[PDB]
Amino acid sequence: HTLVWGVWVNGVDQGDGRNIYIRSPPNNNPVKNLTSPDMTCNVDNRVVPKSVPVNAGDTLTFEWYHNTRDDDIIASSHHGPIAVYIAPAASNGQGNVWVKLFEDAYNVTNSTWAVDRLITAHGQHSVVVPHVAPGDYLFRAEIIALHEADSLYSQNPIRGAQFYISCAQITINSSDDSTPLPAGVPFPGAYTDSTPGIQFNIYTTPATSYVAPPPSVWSGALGGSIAQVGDASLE
1 annotated to a ligand binding site: yes
58 annotated to a ligand binding site: yes
Looking at the DSSP assignment, which residues form a beta bridge with residue 6? Answer: 63
CB of residue 204 to Cu ion, shortest distance in Å: 21
85 annotated to a ligand binding site: no
**Of 35 and 77, which has the nearer Cβ to Cu ion?**
77
Q: Please report, in angstroms and rounded to a whole number, the separation of the first and last CA atoms in the chain.
A: 25
**Of 28 and 179, which has the nearer Cβ to Cu ion?**
28
**Of 24 and 169, which has the nearer Cβ to Cu ion?**
24
DSSP 148: T
3 state DSSP class of 19: coil
CB of residue 163 to Cu ion, shortest distance in Å: 11
**How many angstroms separate the CA atoms of 206 and 198, rounded?**
15
How many Cβ atoms are within 10 Å of 54's Cβ, its own excluded? 22
CB of residue 83 to Cu ion, shortest distance in Å: 18
- Residue 147 as a binder of Cu ion (CB under 5 A): the answer is no
Residues 1 to 40 in contact with Cu ion, rule: CB under 5 A: 1
**Of 19 and 28, which has the nearer Cβ to Cu ion?**
28
Question: Distance of alpha carbon 90 from its chain centroid, rounded?
Answer: 19
Question: Distance of alpha carbon 218 from its chain centroid, rounded?
Answer: 15
What ranges in 32-150 are assigned the alpha helix state H? 114-120
Binding positions for Cu ion, rule: CB under 5 A? 1
Residue ranges at the known binding site for Cu(2+)? 1, 78, 164
